[PDB]
Amino acid sequence: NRDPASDQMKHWKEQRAAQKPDVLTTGGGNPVGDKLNSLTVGPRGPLLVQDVVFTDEMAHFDRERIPERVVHAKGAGAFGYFEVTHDITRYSKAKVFEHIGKRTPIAVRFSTVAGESGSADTVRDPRGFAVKFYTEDGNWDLVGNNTPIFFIRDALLFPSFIHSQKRNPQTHLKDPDMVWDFWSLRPESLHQVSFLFSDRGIPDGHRHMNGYGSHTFKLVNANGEAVYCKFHYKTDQGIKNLSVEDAARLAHEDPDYGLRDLFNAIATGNYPSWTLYIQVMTFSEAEIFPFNPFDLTKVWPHGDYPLIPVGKLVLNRNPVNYFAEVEQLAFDPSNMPPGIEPSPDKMLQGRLFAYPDTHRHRLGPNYLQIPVNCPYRARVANYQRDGPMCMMDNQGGAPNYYPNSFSAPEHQPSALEHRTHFSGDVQRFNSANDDNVTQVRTFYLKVLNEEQRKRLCENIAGHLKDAQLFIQKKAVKNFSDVHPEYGSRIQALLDKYNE
Amino acid sequence: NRDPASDQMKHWKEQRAAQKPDVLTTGGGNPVGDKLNSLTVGPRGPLLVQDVVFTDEMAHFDRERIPERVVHAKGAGAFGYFEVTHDITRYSKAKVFEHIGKRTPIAVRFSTVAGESGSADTVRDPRGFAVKFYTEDGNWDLVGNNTPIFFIRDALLFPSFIHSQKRNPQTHLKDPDMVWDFWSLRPESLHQVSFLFSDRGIPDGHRHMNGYGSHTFKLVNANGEAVYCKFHYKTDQGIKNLSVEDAARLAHEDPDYGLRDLFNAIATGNYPSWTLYIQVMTFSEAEIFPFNPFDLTKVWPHGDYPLIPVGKLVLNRNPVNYFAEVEQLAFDPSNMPPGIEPSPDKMLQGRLFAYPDTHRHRLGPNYLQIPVNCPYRARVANYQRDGPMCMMDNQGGAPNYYPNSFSAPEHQPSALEHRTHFSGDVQRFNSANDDNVTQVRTFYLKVLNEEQRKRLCENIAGHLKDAQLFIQKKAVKNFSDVHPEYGSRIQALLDKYNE
Amino acid sequence: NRDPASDQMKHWKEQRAAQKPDVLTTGGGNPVGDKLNSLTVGPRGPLLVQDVVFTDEMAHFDRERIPERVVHAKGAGAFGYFEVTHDITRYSKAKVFEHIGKRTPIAVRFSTVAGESGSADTVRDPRGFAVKFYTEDGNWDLVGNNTPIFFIRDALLFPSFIHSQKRNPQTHLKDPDMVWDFWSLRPESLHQVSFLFSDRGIPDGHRHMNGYGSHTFKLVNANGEAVYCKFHYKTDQGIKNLSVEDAARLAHEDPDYGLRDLFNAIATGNYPSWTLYIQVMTFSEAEIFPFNPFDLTKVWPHGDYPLIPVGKLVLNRNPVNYFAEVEQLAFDPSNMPPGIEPSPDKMLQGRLFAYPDTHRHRLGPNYLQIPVNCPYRARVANYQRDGPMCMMDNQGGAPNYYPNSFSAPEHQPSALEHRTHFSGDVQRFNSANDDNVTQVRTFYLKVLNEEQRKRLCENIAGHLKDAQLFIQKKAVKNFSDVHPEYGSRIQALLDKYNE
Amino acid sequence: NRDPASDQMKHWKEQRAAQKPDVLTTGGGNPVGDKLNSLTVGPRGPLLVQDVVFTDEMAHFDRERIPERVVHAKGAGAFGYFEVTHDITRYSKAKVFEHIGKRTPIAVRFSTVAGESGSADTVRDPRGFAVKFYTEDGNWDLVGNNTPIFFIRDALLFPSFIHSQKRNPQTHLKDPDMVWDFWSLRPESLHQVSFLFSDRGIPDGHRHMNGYGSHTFKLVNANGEAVYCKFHYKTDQGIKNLSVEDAARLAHEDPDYGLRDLFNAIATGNYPSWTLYIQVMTFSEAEIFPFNPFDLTKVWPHGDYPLIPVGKLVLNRNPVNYFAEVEQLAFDPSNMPPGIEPSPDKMLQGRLFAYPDTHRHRLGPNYLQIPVNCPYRARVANYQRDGPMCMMDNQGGAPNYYPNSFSAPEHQPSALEHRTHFSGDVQRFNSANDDNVTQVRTFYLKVLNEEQRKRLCENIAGHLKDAQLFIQKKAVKNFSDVHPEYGSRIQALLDKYNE
Ligand SMILES: NC(=O)C1=CN([C@@H]2O[C@H](COP(=O)(O)OP(=O)(O)OC[C@H]3O[C@@H](n4cnc5c(N)ncnc54)[C@H](OP(=O)(O)O)[C@@H]3O)[C@@H](O)[C@H]2O)C=CC1
């Protein structure tokens, strides 16, 4: 008698004992007479083409795979609801926030960043925390991480950053020279790197970590007034981390530790939950903010910008088929219902394009008609047609052009976007040296105690150890810019690692 | 007031008059505020990425097209039912023939062969007549033509034949040298070419032609007893042809003559129907048959093997969305319910591989989950999993391996196929010199009268004249092998056409 | 003996006449022993799987087709050169214009707009005129039409317009009600529609029509100064059109009239050529221009902005394999070498995204690695890696991330784009009511003579007659906004055809 | 200084030291002026579509992934040559064996079977060992394992078997009951399962293991005489394994232990070499062989059928780009040059279909035109045309149909297959009850010593304990069917694991 996950097949048989097993059929529904023996000429003769039973199964096996996610490939999924606990209709007119008590079905995916489909869960890396809201004003995808910040603040460095985080193009091995050459040349990453190599770099499962929308977003109320915001969904189960000692053992003992823990939790009625908060910044407060309010490498301090609670996230359902419901999950930051809008955040702007595009590649042009991705709580009506694997009535014989005098769907003026005024030059602005150390200086000295600062440099030194000396001296110098003792600790550890 | 086809949008709006038009939404279900004006900076400024309304629409527009069919690309569709009128249960145990009165939902596609998506309907070519039967034991695709025979009798020559009937690989033009160089090198085409260039080469729409399964098929009844058979669909609307003169006029006046003719018919309640007949040959009679009974270039003469009535095919429903319902239609001759099986027809054996193969490319690995391709009157249960665009529960948490101790689907031993034993060396047997002339001589002398043979040579000479003299003399000689006068009539016209 | 098009294979054999025929192989290069006969057990036995010769040919045949172009599917191709004849280096620093006499290889594709792969060439429609310049600064794609203007001025209407021009989503028929309903609700189409329905709507082949960039572009010289421009590449063969009477005859007599004609021309040494002009507008003149200089439904009058000659485009080579060379051609308006840039033209803005997107769908992620699409006169080096069907060294073992301390490719600061200043509310500005008639009024009264206007109304009336009366009366008033006699001439024709 | 693998970028820079960095261009070859900062409106403004530098970079990143291999996903690659050292031309007429001393370029891929792209290398599993021979008669793909046998002997069980070895359809976890539920229901796997859980289940890298073709193949010499054969390709480095103790440790310390080991070896001049042997069975010996000579779960004993040496395979070159050269490597067992032919092995027959099929999905229809998949030592000439991503001239304007009178490729009668005679009922013959225990018994009793048997049982029990008890005792029952002492040593241990 084992954990509920391993008893998956066992329960399925029990859940069906009263029923008789179905007739085994071909993909076309034709009953198979025998599926253990190939159609051959004589007992030791060759196989026939006429064996259409064989081909139909064999061919589908051959196409079982789809391209994995280009980032965050290793993933865990769950389902539940979002429930409003406070009224913030003064900030957002989004129906998902309409009144206290309102529930919205959600879909959540947890993931790592660099690891592939088969990688270990208990490794040092950021963690994905994507949430899909099935609202009546369409689907809302809040694709956030377990950190309030990221390593870079311009989307043009994202493909580069990821490459450096993955495998060498010739050797196909993880190479720390790629890792630290990038990080040391781009000191803006100092903030997020400090987070990653801290205790929270290896969370104890998916239920013991916080989530952040990271990006500054725009909220718009009914009168047409707008504010900026941050999304924080903090763990109700409490922050708990794994030791570098306990994370490494698990890496071979249970590669899918996070997958198994989440599944076991929900299956056993122990439902994990998060409390959704926001921070709010007025357009006025945005212009006087000491840093760039849309810099993804920046946080909003809690003292100046307190958390305003909105609701609860509860995961109370395990997926039924992992592939069909979790691996085919597609999240689009461009999915924003009326009342929630993007800020001019350089990184967020890039994500508005990238995600729908990649889903059309990874899953298909009509990925939005896949059940788990469908906005099934909205009525989709538009002038979009066809595409590979078209799955519904394709909107019937409805007029497919707009405008028309034949009463096909109409635009909704209520859903017009907030109008902002901008001015300046149209060119590429250098953002590389906005203040990269001040908030990092704050994190190191004020948030961490002396013991965590000690482990922080150790985790850093242990990985920086593999880079060339010129990359090392560059990294240490970048760290010294945060705090001299911080920089001197890492290199002090390095002088011991270099024998 | 006009024909029903053109009034489609008019009728669509009338059908909705009580309702108010829907809110125009994105694929993610988010209402759009305006879909007539782009998000720009100032009235004459640049476009913004944060405008996801444009991208989501445009990106979908970009992927509207899927590969057209490699052959029979130009198509017309309709739906209806198959109804059993006579008892043929002594020959087949197939549920589709179970008792008199039995109805099966069907799907029919009509097509030409060589023309691409935009070509004219009224051209000389064979015609497709594919019928999809939605039976309880899965789908039955009886994929037939308007001819009992074909141009070739070996599956390895099919790509070649097709290439020769389509466009020249350099000029992208129809090439008479490609067409007849082939035909003259493969005299077996003499039978079907004679059919093609007769009156029935250009049918007056799809409602005035017969359809044939062409292939000899196998029928197996409840006792496991087997016979060979042919399928015949004779028009209840009567054979009716176009003169080449009026077919040519319609080619520019109405490129979609056959498509609209069908649509207008059904919409005005005038439902087209065909009468299903069979011919039956016992294992005893097959071996004493003068020719190869599985030779696709051979008919079974009515004198020896008369038609046995089975039922009626009735088309009484038009497609609602052509693309979702007719362009994504997939017929697999390999889709055969218990009671219907393949003969050793070299060509039919080849078709068992090709169609499922091409559909996985054209539509996708999971093309059978598309509504019109789905066997919705049967329960698909098997150990096939995953694949791109997985659309249902993916059969849940059911055990995905076979055999298993967990009550996942089981084979059904009753649905085993009839067992025949075969022998001779396993080798590549030459089929080039089976009787190519006897049945053709028969067709020329017995079935055609003096005026139709006269037009037959005129229709042939009119096309062969564009081929080189060495090809003409080669083709004519093949026609001379059929009948001296047949060869001599063609050469008489060619000498005038050659100036 | 026949035209060069018909003798393609004939010449192919003679051009090879000295050599022995090559060994017929599988895709894996294995020689075939027999490709006319299937491997079976006994002369009348079932086909074997062990026949991998059959499978390999058939499997490839099954995948011969790729998704056709969403628009401009019916096409003719040629290759040649662009030669600079005049000096415009004071306007553009682009290498393609560097000195007089300089030649650059080009590729040209001709197309209609609405017709599918099999549709007729000689129909009333705009004509595609895409030119790809293989410059040292990368490829330059000038994707223009045979008209200086278009039907719409916002990219959000393009999917709408196209749908209206193609087949009904239910009946799959061309629908005059769809066609004019769009046009009548959108009077901005009045300009281009006026072009389309008089003589130049049906050009006599591809060599007797002009080409236009239509869009306003930006030119930037060595001093960093910018101007706006229009591209006109006018035919050296002279404008020549087909009458409605016989253009219709060719639709059925020779569906590929332009396809054959273009091929025949080059092969017989008559190389077609076009003379490239530009028009130039300063930023200052853009500010005083009476209309929106980026309204695609507007021309720059020759009086105000005279043509400046640049060079010749000459097509002097026929393609060798149509598919590999013309069907796989991908033109990207986003392909612009340093010195040539986009204006804030809304329609042009949309094309920057749309074209690269669909090409990744239609052809593939690595579509730029296809020979005709490859920038073979430039050195492609970047941090792009992998993707489906990667065909080269994949840039070797070079570092794939940027920045790096390992001497991977570097930015070229000179190649930065022009800096413009923009400001205004970020909002969707209504352009629906920009002047729709003035330039149209000018075209009607000043450019056309009395019979061309008479023929113009006939062609419109001949097409509009099939639409509903409310659509007719709506359209006529739109035409009346151009000129009272114009609307009334059309209306005089409609009242008798409506019996 | 570090291992050669880690110094890849260091060395890349050195090889380039004289050179200055390339001009960074778009995929279309246009140089980019700045690729670190985005095109925006104002320093803190929104992103523009006009930034095509960004869009195309992101879009290509979005499409970097292709479906990983459905099996054998985790892989290592190397290149070298095959050298003939002995004469076996009396057995085979294949050009790869034509004379002593002859060298042929090879491509090798090493792999696990079940693990995905991110899985650990040092796990208990079979090892893939594929060799691609680039012969003048086309490519010869010898797709073998590190075992002479397999778990099953019929192709219809392969997809089922694989699923059981992979992840649970709901929980997405490795599931021990799935593994053994299958294995215990199919006792033929006892042989391969016995091999797997012995020392050689976890080899010390890829250079310390043997390769086997496993399948019986056919050899044909010039006289048309045929023999059956097994390929045994033995390591020159000697068998060397990792204990499970350090194999578990290496699993988290170095996920790509084998990948790095292979690369490091080749880079340091330490070239791995293996010796190719064959076993030969005459048609006469096949009829008297006590077991099925085509049973993939059976070996040919060395005593009756001694090893005949053929040549050497040597790997002396590392890949330059892993993706282009190793991840896109495609092996087809159906790729067989004249002189090598398939036996009637049920499993091998299935693989003729499966591999070409899956590659058309994974890589593309035209995957054989990929450099590493291309038969560059052969001339591909045939009548195959078009398809997505066509990369050469597509065989020019050559005639695309066969037969033809225009001197296109001709079949080569020399390349006909060996002709065999067969007889029997065409039916599905049951292979479940061929002798499943005898050859396993000798391995346990005669080949293993007393300590290896002890560990064999420990490793099984260590893994089998996780399955349900009803599954365990059934599996244990199979082990006792091999030998009573073998079964209960295992059973003594499971009962210890059952607390
Ligand atoms: N046996 C068959 O299935 C067919 C036979 N034939 C040809 O007729 C010869 C004799 O057949 P037999 O059965 O002995 O005598 P029949 O006269 O009974 O064969 C009559 C068949 O010829 C068909 N037919 C009549 N005119 C044409 C035409 N212009 N183009 C194509 N088909 C036409 C009829 O179609 P309908 O059924 O509408 O009268 C009928 O099916 C055969 O050798 C064969 O070549 C022709 C078609 C099929």
PDB file of C-alpha atoms in Angstrom, chain B residues 2 6 8-9 34 36-40 42 44-47 51 54 57-59 61-65 68 70 118-119 154-157 163 166-173 177-178 248 252 256 259-260 263 291-293 319-322 344 346 349-350 354 357-358 361 422 425-431 466 468, chain C residues 2 5 8-10 36-40 42 44 46-48 51 54 57-59 61-65 70 116 118-119 154-157 163 166-173 177-178 248 251-252 256 259 263 291-293 319-322 344 349-350 354 357-358 361 422 425-431 466 468:
ATOM      1  CA  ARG B   2     -32.346  34.188 -57.208  1.00  0.00           C
ATOM      2  CA  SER B   6     -26.438  32.873 -53.696  1.00  0.00           C
ATOM      3  CA  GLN B   8     -26.974  31.741 -48.361  1.00  0.00           C
ATOM      4  CA  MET B   9     -25.981  34.855 -46.399  1.00  0.00           C
ATOM      5  CA  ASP B  34     -12.399  47.924 -32.321  1.00  0.00           C
ATOM      6  CA  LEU B  36     -11.567  48.427 -37.942  1.00  0.00           C
ATOM      7  CA  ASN B  37      -8.693  50.651 -36.734  1.00  0.00           C
ATOM      8  CA  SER B  38      -5.087  49.857 -35.802  1.00  0.00           C
ATOM      9  CA  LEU B  39      -3.395  50.775 -32.533  1.00  0.00           C
ATOM     10  CA  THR B  40      -0.857  53.441 -33.505  1.00  0.00           C
ATOM     11  CA  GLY B  42      -0.732  59.397 -33.327  1.00  0.00           C
ATOM     12  CA  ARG B  44       0.076  58.860 -38.709  1.00  0.00           C
ATOM     13  CA  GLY B  45       2.348  56.899 -36.392  1.00  0.00           C
ATOM     14  CA  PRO B  46       3.831  53.365 -36.272  1.00  0.00           C
ATOM     15  CA  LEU B  47       1.989  50.186 -35.248  1.00  0.00           C
ATOM     16  CA  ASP B  51      -2.027  45.461 -30.197  1.00  0.00           C
ATOM     17  CA  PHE B  54      -4.212  42.482 -34.960  1.00  0.00           C
ATOM     18  CA  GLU B  57      -6.307  37.810 -36.310  1.00  0.00           C
ATOM     19  CA  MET B  58      -3.472  38.125 -38.788  1.00  0.00           C
ATOM     20  CA  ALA B  59      -1.573  35.078 -37.543  1.00  0.00           C
ATOM     21  CA  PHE B  61      -5.315  34.425 -41.437  1.00  0.00           C
ATOM     22  CA  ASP B  62      -1.763  33.310 -42.269  1.00  0.00           C
ATOM     23  CA  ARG B  63      -2.550  29.678 -41.457  1.00  0.00           C
ATOM     24  CA  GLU B  64      -5.970  29.308 -43.054  1.00  0.00           C
ATOM     25  CA  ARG B  65      -4.691  27.032 -45.828  1.00  0.00           C
ATOM     26  CA  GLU B  68      -4.782  20.434 -50.886  1.00  0.00           C
ATOM     27  CA  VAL B  70      -2.407  15.356 -53.803  1.00  0.00           C
ATOM     28  CA  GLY B 118      -9.447  26.301 -58.374  1.00  0.00           C
ATOM     29  CA  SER B 119      -9.965  24.374 -61.607  1.00  0.00           C
ATOM     30  CA  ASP B 154      -0.006  -1.944 -60.248  1.00  0.00           C
ATOM     31  CA  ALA B 155       0.359   0.357 -57.270  1.00  0.00           C
ATOM     32  CA  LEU B 156       3.973   1.247 -58.124  1.00  0.00           C
ATOM     33  CA  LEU B 157       2.861   3.027 -61.302  1.00  0.00           C
ATOM     34  CA  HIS B 163       2.602  13.041 -62.427  1.00  0.00           C
ATOM     35  CA  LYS B 166      -0.619  16.851 -63.981  1.00  0.00           C
ATOM     36  CA  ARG B 167       1.787  19.690 -64.633  1.00  0.00           C
ATOM     37  CA  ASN B 168       5.223  19.584 -66.232  1.00  0.00           C
ATOM     38  CA  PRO B 169       7.858  19.971 -63.496  1.00  0.00           C
ATOM     39  CA  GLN B 170       9.549  22.894 -65.307  1.00  0.00           C
ATOM     40  CA  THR B 171       6.891  24.809 -67.251  1.00  0.00           C
ATOM     41  CA  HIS B 172       4.089  23.972 -64.799  1.00  0.00           C
ATOM     42  CA  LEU B 173       1.834  23.416 -67.815  1.00  0.00           C
ATOM     43  CA  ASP B 177       3.615  14.464 -74.199  1.00  0.00           C
ATOM     44  CA  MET B 178       3.564  13.525 -70.537  1.00  0.00           C
ATOM     45  CA  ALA B 248     -16.147  24.253 -72.573  1.00  0.00           C
ATOM     46  CA  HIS B 252     -15.256  29.966 -68.017  1.00  0.00           C
ATOM     47  CA  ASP B 256     -18.046  25.629 -60.151  1.00  0.00           C
ATOM     48  CA  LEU B 259     -20.580  22.103 -57.083  1.00  0.00           C
ATOM     49  CA  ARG B 260     -23.472  24.592 -57.188  1.00  0.00           C
ATOM     50  CA  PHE B 263     -26.019  22.455 -53.646  1.00  0.00           C
ATOM     51  CA  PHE B 291      -8.830 -12.932 -66.837  1.00  0.00           C
ATOM     52  CA  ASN B 292      -7.318 -11.989 -63.478  1.00  0.00           C
ATOM     53  CA  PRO B 293     -10.396 -11.375 -61.264  1.00  0.00           C
ATOM     54  CA  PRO B 319     -22.452  21.042 -45.757  1.00  0.00           C
ATOM     55  CA  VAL B 320     -22.737  23.969 -43.323  1.00  0.00           C
ATOM     56  CA  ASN B 321     -19.086  24.897 -43.442  1.00  0.00           C
ATOM     57  CA  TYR B 322     -17.346  23.587 -46.535  1.00  0.00           C
ATOM     58  CA  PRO B 344      -5.496  -9.405 -53.433  1.00  0.00           C
ATOM     59  CA  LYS B 346      -2.470  -5.239 -56.431  1.00  0.00           C
ATOM     60  CA  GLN B 349      -3.434  -3.527 -51.567  1.00  0.00           C
ATOM     61  CA  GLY B 350      -1.452  -0.353 -52.234  1.00  0.00           C
ATOM     62  CA  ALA B 354      -1.386   5.468 -49.054  1.00  0.00           C
ATOM     63  CA  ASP B 357      -0.328   7.981 -44.755  1.00  0.00           C
ATOM     64  CA  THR B 358      -1.283  11.111 -46.730  1.00  0.00           C
ATOM     65  CA  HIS B 361       0.473  14.749 -43.481  1.00  0.00           C
ATOM     66  CA  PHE B 422      -1.420 -18.473 -50.861  1.00  0.00           C
ATOM     67  CA  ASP B 425       7.623 -17.649 -55.217  1.00  0.00           C
ATOM     68  CA  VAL B 426       7.759 -14.305 -53.416  1.00  0.00           C
ATOM     69  CA  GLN B 427       8.840 -12.171 -56.323  1.00  0.00           C
ATOM     70  CA  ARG B 428       7.986  -9.191 -58.526  1.00  0.00           C
ATOM     71  CA  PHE B 429       5.547 -10.595 -61.135  1.00  0.00           C
ATOM     72  CA  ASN B 430       5.112  -8.839 -64.511  1.00  0.00           C
ATOM     73  CA  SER B 431       1.577  -7.575 -65.132  1.00  0.00           C
ATOM     74  CA  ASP B 466      -0.773  17.791 -79.593  1.00  0.00           C
ATOM     75  CA  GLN B 468       4.741  14.177 -80.976  1.00  0.00           C
TER      76      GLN B 468
ATOM     77  CA  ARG C   2       5.288  23.291 -81.249  1.00  0.00           C
ATOM     78  CA  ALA C   5       6.780  25.154 -73.529  1.00  0.00           C
ATOM     79  CA  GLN C   8      10.294  20.761 -72.527  1.00  0.00           C
ATOM     80  CA  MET C   9      10.826  17.023 -72.192  1.00  0.00           C
ATOM     81  CA  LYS C  10      11.819  16.772 -75.864  1.00  0.00           C
ATOM     82  CA  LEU C  36       6.895  -1.531 -62.452  1.00  0.00           C
ATOM     83  CA  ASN C  37       6.019  -4.582 -60.361  1.00  0.00           C
ATOM     84  CA  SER C  38       4.905  -5.029 -56.769  1.00  0.00           C
ATOM     85  CA  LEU C  39       6.426  -7.635 -54.450  1.00  0.00           C
ATOM     86  CA  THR C  40       3.648 -10.164 -53.837  1.00  0.00           C
ATOM     87  CA  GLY C  42       2.202 -15.584 -55.882  1.00  0.00           C
ATOM     88  CA  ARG C  44      -2.497 -13.185 -57.312  1.00  0.00           C
ATOM     89  CA  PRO C  46      -1.351  -9.966 -51.191  1.00  0.00           C
ATOM     90  CA  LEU C  47       1.294  -7.239 -51.249  1.00  0.00           C
ATOM     91  CA  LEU C  48       4.208  -7.434 -48.801  1.00  0.00           C
ATOM     92  CA  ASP C  51       8.454  -4.069 -50.432  1.00  0.00           C
ATOM     93  CA  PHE C  54       6.706   0.735 -52.945  1.00  0.00           C
ATOM     94  CA  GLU C  57       7.784   6.095 -53.466  1.00  0.00           C
ATOM     95  CA  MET C  58       4.200   6.142 -52.241  1.00  0.00           C
ATOM     96  CA  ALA C  59       5.023   7.764 -48.928  1.00  0.00           C
ATOM     97  CA  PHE C  61       3.846  10.954 -53.237  1.00  0.00           C
ATOM     98  CA  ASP C  62       1.501  11.265 -50.246  1.00  0.00           C
ATOM     99  CA  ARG C  63       3.447  14.319 -49.082  1.00  0.00           C
ATOM    100  CA  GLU C  64       3.975  16.066 -52.418  1.00  0.00           C
ATOM    101  CA  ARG C  65       1.704  19.027 -51.625  1.00  0.00           C
ATOM    102  CA  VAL C  70      -3.434  32.173 -48.790  1.00  0.00           C
ATOM    103  CA  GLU C 116      -6.583  29.058 -56.316  1.00  0.00           C
ATOM    104  CA  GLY C 118      -5.969  25.557 -60.530  1.00  0.00           C
ATOM    105  CA  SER C 119      -7.825  28.764 -61.367  1.00  0.00           C
ATOM    106  CA  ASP C 154      -6.025  49.338 -42.489  1.00  0.00           C
ATOM    107  CA  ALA C 155      -4.416  45.940 -42.002  1.00  0.00           C
ATOM    108  CA  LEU C 156      -7.274  44.885 -39.724  1.00  0.00           C
ATOM    109  CA  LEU C 157      -9.494  44.828 -42.812  1.00  0.00           C
ATOM    110  CA  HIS C 163     -12.659  36.510 -47.289  1.00  0.00           C
ATOM    111  CA  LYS C 166     -12.982  34.285 -52.069  1.00  0.00           C
ATOM    112  CA  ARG C 167     -15.478  31.474 -51.613  1.00  0.00           C
ATOM    113  CA  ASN C 168     -18.562  31.387 -49.389  1.00  0.00           C
ATOM    114  CA  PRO C 169     -17.797  29.551 -46.134  1.00  0.00           C
ATOM    115  CA  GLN C 170     -20.774  27.224 -46.714  1.00  0.00           C
ATOM    116  CA  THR C 171     -21.385  26.940 -50.440  1.00  0.00           C
ATOM    117  CA  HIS C 172     -17.716  27.344 -51.407  1.00  0.00           C
ATOM    118  CA  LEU C 173     -18.905  29.486 -54.290  1.00  0.00           C
ATOM    119  CA  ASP C 177     -23.161  39.475 -52.457  1.00  0.00           C
ATOM    120  CA  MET C 178     -20.025  39.010 -50.337  1.00  0.00           C
ATOM    121  CA  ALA C 248     -13.103  34.806 -71.181  1.00  0.00           C
ATOM    122  CA  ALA C 251     -10.110  30.969 -69.342  1.00  0.00           C
ATOM    123  CA  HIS C 252     -11.282  27.722 -70.869  1.00  0.00           C
ATOM    124  CA  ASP C 256      -2.366  29.208 -68.058  1.00  0.00           C
ATOM    125  CA  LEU C 259       2.051  31.147 -67.408  1.00  0.00           C
ATOM    126  CA  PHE C 263       7.813  31.037 -70.197  1.00  0.00           C
ATOM    127  CA  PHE C 291      -4.142  63.804 -47.954  1.00  0.00           C
ATOM    128  CA  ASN C 292      -2.416  61.268 -45.731  1.00  0.00           C
ATOM    129  CA  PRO C 293       0.829  60.501 -47.626  1.00  0.00           C
ATOM    130  CA  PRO C 319      12.851  28.252 -63.866  1.00  0.00           C
ATOM    131  CA  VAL C 320      14.224  24.704 -64.129  1.00  0.00           C
ATOM    132  CA  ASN C 321      11.955  23.138 -61.517  1.00  0.00           C
ATOM    133  CA  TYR C 322       8.775  25.113 -60.832  1.00  0.00           C
ATOM    134  CA  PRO C 344       4.268  54.528 -40.951  1.00  0.00           C
ATOM    135  CA  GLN C 349       3.006  48.084 -41.002  1.00  0.00           C
ATOM    136  CA  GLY C 350       0.816  45.019 -41.055  1.00  0.00           C
ATOM    137  CA  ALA C 354       2.172  38.872 -41.693  1.00  0.00           C
ATOM    138  CA  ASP C 357       4.663  34.471 -40.165  1.00  0.00           C
ATOM    139  CA  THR C 358       2.842  32.648 -42.990  1.00  0.00           C
ATOM    140  CA  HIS C 361       3.689  28.007 -41.735  1.00  0.00           C
ATOM    141  CA  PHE C 422       6.118  60.576 -33.072  1.00  0.00           C
ATOM    142  CA  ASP C 425      -2.582  59.359 -27.907  1.00  0.00           C
ATOM    143  CA  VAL C 426      -2.032  55.635 -28.345  1.00  0.00           C
ATOM    144  CA  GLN C 427      -5.449  54.913 -29.744  1.00  0.00           C
ATOM    145  CA  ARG C 428      -7.302  53.474 -32.726  1.00  0.00           C
ATOM    146  CA  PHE C 429      -7.787  56.468 -35.024  1.00  0.00           C
ATOM    147  CA  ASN C 430     -10.671  56.422 -37.441  1.00  0.00           C
ATOM    148  CA  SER C 431      -9.421  56.475 -41.042  1.00  0.00           C
ATOM    149  CA  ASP C 466     -25.931  39.691 -59.100  1.00  0.00           C
ATOM    150  CA  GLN C 468     -29.156  42.195 -53.630  1.00  0.00           C
TER     151      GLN C 468
END
